[PDB]
């Protein structure tokens, strides 16, 4: 049930701007079969790197690409749900993690990070609608401010408002 592992952008799909890319489209019941099929590339002639599920058509669209691949257009669509591969999500930070988008969502001390959009416990100025450039989603530690500390999250701990998360840097 790896569907839970892959990253979900709801109400979102992708369109390829490059002709060379090939999309594997097939109607099924649920995105669960899409995830199972892309997981092991079932009948997939390529390196499946994302898939968009359409509930209206109940159809999988499998891609050897995803959002971070160049030449791809992000499209808001309520019937479209985009899913990206974590194993195709770089899980070490380049600099201050300014571009990092992986799903590590726990404080360095080991505390559960709070949802960004929610304001409990702590209200804050940083919001997805306000801040669309960095594209924080629910709890993924980010540094939209580009703070030296790296990606941080507002702790769900009432006592501590915020904490920088722990990532292994790509220290060559």
């Amino acid at each position: 049930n790896t569907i839970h592992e892959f990253k979900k952008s709801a109400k979102t799909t992708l369109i390829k701007i490059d002709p060379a890319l090939k999309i594997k489209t097939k109607k099924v019941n649920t995105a669960d079969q899409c995830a199972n099929r892309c997981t092991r590339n079932k009948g997939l002639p390529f390196t499946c790197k994302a898939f968009v599920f359409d509930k209206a058509r109940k159809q999988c669209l499998w891609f050897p690409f995803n959002s971070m691949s160049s030449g791809v257009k992000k499209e808001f669509g309520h019937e479209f749900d985009l899913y990206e591969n974590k194993d195709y999500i770089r899980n070490c930070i380049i600099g201050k993690g300014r571009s990092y988008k992986g799903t590590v969502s726990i404080t360095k001390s080991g505390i559960k990070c709070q949802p960004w959009s929610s304001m409990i416990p702590h209200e804050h100025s940083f919001l997805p609608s306000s801040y669309r450039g960095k594209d924080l989603q629910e709890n993924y530690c980010r540094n939209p401010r580009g703070e030296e500390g790296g990606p941080w999250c507002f702790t769900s701990n009432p006592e501590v408002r915020y904490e920088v998360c722990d990532i292994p840097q790509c220290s060559e």
Binding site: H124, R145, E147, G149, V164
Partner: protein
């Protein structure tokens, strides 16, 4: 160049002879409780109509409160201050006042409101109609189960009074009966001297009673604290009694940290749609708005660094419910005492530690001046607050998280600091007025605007919200109709 800071505008104005303890709006009549006096005015023009005096009374211990003792040649003459004013409308439209001069002997009066007087005494070890304290108290009443229920926080000098209690008036309208002993909560006599408690506001939302208090951070802590207190509304007594500390702090978000412990005043309302999202609260939701001050070290004195911040009531309720660890919950120190039998374990009273924090809404705009009174209203989508000042200046600001908005209305009212007690009235077509105290003078201020001429740059005039529909007449900010030609931006 920037803004004509103070410009004097003459408005409908009433002046009194004594400081005003209370202001109330009810049925086209303005009810003011001032020292020794009870003024009644026409809402439209601030023309004083009728008043009932309560002049400085004679005091003698032998004389019982209600019956007047003009035969006391041996004893003092002491001034009377109205502790609280209440208006009853579920029954006959009438006014119930209480002053400290008679040890909280409330009197009620059933155009003029001085028509009748009824001294509320019900003659015995404890006094069930010694209602209000003298040095400090807060009162708020609301119709509960067709009987107006009275919520009374009390301060005691350690010299029959209870810290907080709820009493109900008998239909005979003669006095109040404490249904239960847990209907009141008391500080221990040892600590009655220390650990001062003060009340600032009270209200109800969503079937729950909320009081706001400032008092020492802990017993023998030599430091103060702001807390809210919530409990159910049951005539029998205070059952789901809980309190927790509140904190307002602004700091850089990622990881300049200053904290404003001391509360000053507050106001309850509904938000504007733009800011409803700015705080992630529904437009229907009720929100408290608090004004806070920092303290001098281990002092109740407020330094002149003030802030305000908002609180979704659901947020506070949730923090009461689940968001805090069950371990940090501690015993009620000043009620049960540290050496409490039930400490190691309807019935219980609770005390909380990890304060709920909220950030400043004005990003420190007033880290230089002190703030006294607050009021909230909406204009279409927008929401606007009318602030109070320790100096006495008055101003209005469009409240929104989207950057700091300059005071679209600002000037300096009378010499007295702005009193905390205000009443804002909204009439249809987005016209309304604030009733604001300053010493012994009331002021009624329109909502729509106070003269667009207070602008000193084209950019300054452009920030004026569109509901004013006033603009730049090519050299100065005056509206379109008073811009002779069309060169009006």
């Amino acid at each position: 160049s920037e803004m004509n800071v103070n410009m004097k505008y003459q408005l409908p104005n009433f002046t009194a002879e004594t400081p005003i303890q209370n202001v109330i709006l009810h049925e086209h009549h303005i009810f003011l409780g001032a020292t020794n006096y009870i003024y009644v005015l026409n809402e439209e023009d601030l023309q004083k109509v009728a008043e009932y005096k309560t002049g400085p009374v004679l005091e003698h211990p032998d004389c019982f409160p209600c019956q007047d003792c003009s035969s006391k040649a041996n004893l003092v003459w002491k001034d009377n201050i109205n502790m609280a004013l209440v208006v009853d409308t579920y029954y006959d439209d009438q006014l119930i006042s209480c002053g400290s001069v008679n040890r909280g002997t409330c009197q009620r009066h059933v155009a003029d409101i001085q028509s009748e007087v009824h001294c509320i005494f019900s003659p015995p070890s404890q006094c069930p109609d010694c209602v209000v304290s003298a040095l400090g108290a807060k009162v708020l009443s609301s119709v509960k189960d067709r009987f107006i229920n009275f919520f009374v926080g009390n301060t005691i000098n350690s010299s029959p009074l209870h810290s907080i209690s709820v009493r109900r008036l008998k239909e005979t309208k003669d006095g109040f009966m404490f249904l239960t002993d847990q209907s009141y909560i008391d500080v221990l006599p040892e600590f009655r001297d220390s650990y001062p408690i003060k009340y600032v506001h009270a209200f109800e939302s969503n079937n729950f009673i909320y009081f706001l208090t400032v008092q020492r951070e802990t017993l023998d802590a030599q430091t103060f604290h702001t807390r809210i207190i919530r409990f159910c509304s049951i005539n029998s007594g205070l059952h789901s009694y809980m309190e927790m500390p509140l904190e307002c702090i602004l700091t850089e978000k990622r990881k300049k940290k200053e904290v404003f412990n001391i509360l000053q005043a507050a106001y309850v309302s509904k938000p504007g749609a733009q800011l409803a999202r700015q705080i992630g609260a529904s437009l229907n939701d009720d929100i408290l708005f608090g004004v806070f001050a920092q303290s001098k070290p281990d002092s109740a004195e407020p330094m002149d660094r003030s802030a305000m911040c908002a609180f979704p009531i659901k947020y506070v309720n949730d923090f009461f419910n689940k968001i805090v660890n069950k371990n940090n919950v501690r015993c009620l120190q000043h009620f049960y005492g540290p050496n409490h039998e039930h400490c190691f374990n309807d019935e219980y009273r609770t005390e909380f530690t990890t304060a709920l924090q909220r950030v400043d809404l004005f990003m420190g705009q007033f880290s230089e001046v002190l703030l006294t009174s607050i009021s909230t209203f909406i204009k279409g989508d927008l929401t606007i607050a009318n602030l109070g000042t320790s100096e006495g200046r008055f101003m209005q600001v469009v409240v929104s998280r989207s950057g700091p908005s300059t005071p679209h209305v600002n000037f300096l009212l009378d010499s007295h600091p702005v009193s905390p007690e205000v009443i804002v009235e909204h009439t249809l077509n987005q016209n309304g007025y604030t009733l604001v105290i300053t010493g012994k003078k009331i002021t009624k201020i329109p909502l729509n605007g106070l003269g667009c001429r207070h602008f000193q740059s084209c950019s300054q005039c452009l920030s004026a919200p569109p509901f004013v529909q006033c603009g730049w007449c090519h050299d100065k900010c005056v509206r379109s109709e008073e811009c002779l030609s069309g060169t009006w931006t």
